[PDB]
Amino acid sequence: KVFGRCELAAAMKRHGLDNYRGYSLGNWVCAAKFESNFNTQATNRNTDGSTNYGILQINSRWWCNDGRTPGSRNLCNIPCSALLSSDITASVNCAKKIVSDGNGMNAWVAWRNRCKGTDVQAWIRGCRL
């Protein structure tokens, strides 16, 4: 599924991401924009052989099982395919664990490079939320 901007903000708010670990909703929308262009089916292979999955491009090295990442962990206890669903619950629940891991949203390199310090509230402006 390719979400609309305000549609994702609304879904993310419902699943409890708004201000989760101090990160306003716009940070999460921005992160998803640049990770996946709001497409739940986004996948991208990493140089190390791991793969990134879903709207927030969660990686198989640590967080999900895809059966093809030697030596990796599955800390969200899910198949990486669950991160591709039109239903964002698995992605949100795993994002919550990742953002709690010590480095906050810096865990998402694109959030740090493209969202961090910017007017992130712009990503939710005009939305009924």
Question: Could you list the residues that contact Cl ion (CB under 5 A)?
Answer: 5, 24-26, 67, 69, 72, 104, 121
Q: Which residue do the tokens 């899910």 mark?
A: 78
Give least dist CB 89 to Cl ion, A: 22
Task: Tell me the C-alpha distance between 103 and 54, whole Å.
Answer: 20
Shortest approach of Na ion to residue 73 CB, angstroms? 6
- Measured from the CB atom, the residue of 24 and 81 that comes closer to Na ion is 81
CB closer to Na ion out of 6 and 75: 75
Residue whose beta carbon is closest to Cl ion: 26
For helices 25-36 and 5-14, give the axis angle rounded to 10 degrees.
Answer: 130
Could you tell me which residues are beta bridge partners of residue 65? 79
DSSP 68-92: -STT---TT-SBGGGGGSSSTHHHH
Extract the tokens encoding 93.
């629940």
Identify which of residues 40 and 65 has a Cβ nearer to Na ion in the complex. Answer: 65
The least distance separating Na ion from the CB of residue 75, rounded to whole angstroms, comes to: 8
Residues that bind Na ion (CB under 5 A): 60, 65, 69, 72, 74
